[PDB]
Amino acid sequence: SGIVPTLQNIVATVTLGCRLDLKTVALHARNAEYNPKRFAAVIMRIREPKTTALIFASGKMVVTGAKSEDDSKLASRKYARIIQKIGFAAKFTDFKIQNIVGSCDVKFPIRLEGLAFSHGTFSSYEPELFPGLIYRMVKPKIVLLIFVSGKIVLTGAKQREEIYQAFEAIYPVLSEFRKM
Amino acid sequence: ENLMLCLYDKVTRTKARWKCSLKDGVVTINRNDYTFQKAQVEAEWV
Amino acid sequence: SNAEASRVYEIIVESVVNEVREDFENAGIDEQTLQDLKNIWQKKLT
Amino acid sequence: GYYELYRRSTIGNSLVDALDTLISDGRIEASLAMRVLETFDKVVAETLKDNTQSKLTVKGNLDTYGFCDDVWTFIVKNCQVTVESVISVDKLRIVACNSK
DNA sequence: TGTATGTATATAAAAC
DNA sequence: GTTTTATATACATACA
To answer: Distance between alpha carbon C1 and the CA centroid of its chain, in Å?
Structure first.
């Protein structure tokens, strides 16, 4: 199809290689939060790339919200420099994209109950609990959120081609259960 | 020099929109001083 | 510009001075020294 | 108890300056100056609690925020402030301590 | 009694 | 339990 899912979020991990004093980081980094009574990490944000970082005492870090592999790595590097400039002997090691989320619109209503019954082995649909159908694909190990409006959410990918392939696999099934 | 000293009741955020419920404070804005019981802050981060 | 501010400020000066008087008298300093503190503080404050 | 943040206010600095003078300029008992400031901290707190009516509204761009040790710091740019009048400020710094 | 925000529900993933 | 993102329902407080 000429429909290609749009990437909405990417999560990554990086090892800085040193231990950090979270309070020092907090007191010296702009736009940073540190509340050990809520979450044992420093939450830090930057505008470009617009992302959020969970920095830890172990030197472990998680970066979220990026919409491209390039942005994800770039932001991660920015947080790294900021930590280094504060005085910590940080390094940028083992950068790894752990999850990629995507979404698309097929532009036609979908018969969810029908979809669920035909593909019961993969489908979960309790509209009273949640309005979308939870379809767990085995092929590319991807989880899709199918809605009666024709909008799709695809998540759990290590690389974008998985999101892409997961949609190409599901598309025929969507046409198969089009409600019009 | 445009400094507000006070207490916070609640601070929240949704996307880049922050809201703050401030109490019992004093501010100096443009060489003038104000004292307040309550204050609400609606600010958009980028 | 605010009036409540000046009123609050007045309450603060008057309230602090009278409370501080005990300690001032304990330290055997001087009632007129307390009066000076009041006048200078209010002077700086303008 | 009682935070010392209000010493940074116009009225707080003025007090500091007055006392510093009595100490240096004169021979007025220091340490007592501290006693006075301890009184200041409490008074400003109760006064701002029991003797205020104004409600303020600040709207603008959030240039910077931050949290550490029960203190929130915000720096609002290009903001309009509403008293109960509408005032505009290029840059406003806000420091808030936990009410609890 | 609408327009607003809020809560909640459900998905992947890492770090503590 | 935190943080991020698409998506969609009910429900719950407010506000003039």
So the answer is: 22
Residues D77 and D79: their CA atoms lie apart, in Å, by 6
Q: Which residues pair with A64 in a beta bridge?
A: A52
**Cβ of residue A156 lies below 7 Å from strand E:** yes
- Which tokens is D60 given? 């603008």
Optimal mutation site among B13, B27, B30, B32, interface D, most CBs of chain D within 10 A: B27
What is the token pair recorded at A118?
């035909």
Residues of chain B immediately before an interruption (C to N > 2.5 Å): none
CATH of B1-46, one of 1.20.1440.20, 2.30.18.10, 3.90.1150.10, 3.40.50.2000: 2.30.18.10
Using CA atoms, how far apart are residues D63 and A104, in angstroms rounded to an integer? 34
C-beta atoms surrounding A146 within 10 Å: 25
- Resolution of this structure in Å: 2.5
Within this chain, do residues A153 and A84 fall inside the same structural domain, yes or no? no
| Distance of alpha carbon D3 from alpha carbon D72, whole angstroms | 14
What is the rounded CA–CA span in Å between residue B30 and residue D89? 7
The whole-angstrom distance between B30's CA and the closest CA on chain C is 9
DSSP secondary-structure letter at A178?
B
Q: Identify how the structure was determined.
A: X-ray
Q: Is the CB of A54 under 7 A from strand E?
A: yes
| A166 vs A144: CA distance, rounded Å | 8
Q: Are chains A and C in contact at 3+ CB pairs closer than 8 Å? A: no
User: Please, which residues have CB within 8 angstroms of residue C24's CB and are 6 or more apart in sequence?
Assistant: C30, C31, C33, C34, D32
Phi, then psi, of A112 in degrees rounded to 5: -55, -50
Mind listing the domains of chain D with CATH numbers?
1-53 (1.10.287.190), 54-100 (2.30.18.10)
